[PDB]
């Protein structure tokens, strides 16, 4: 049985905007798991959630 592509009509899209204070960061992502995005970004930036 062969594989499949999601082929969602909106491709991977995101905008990441630093606030400029306390290394605050707002991510605007096309995703299903905002908590996971919050974790991997905070872990990458070595910041608390």
């Amino acid at each position: 049985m062969g594989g499949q592509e999601h082929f969602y009509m909106e491709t991977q899209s995101m905008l990441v905007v630093p606030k400029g204070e306390d290394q605050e960061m707002d991510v605007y992502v096309s995703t299903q798991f905002p908590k996971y995005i919050q974790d991997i970004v905070a872990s990458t930036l070595k910041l608390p959630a």
């Binding site: 908590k35 919050q38 974790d39 905070a42 608390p48 959630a49």
Partner: protein
Amino acid sequence: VEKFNAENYWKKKGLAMVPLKFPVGLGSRAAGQAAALVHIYLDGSVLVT
């Protein structure tokens, strides 16, 4: 200061002391009403507003 005022004619000193009772309160109980919102993320950090 009374010694200065009697010795000097074109320069005078002054001294005063006032008491303070500042009552604190609003109009009704509904005007002193406050609210807050607290989150605790899985890394242990807390966001309050």
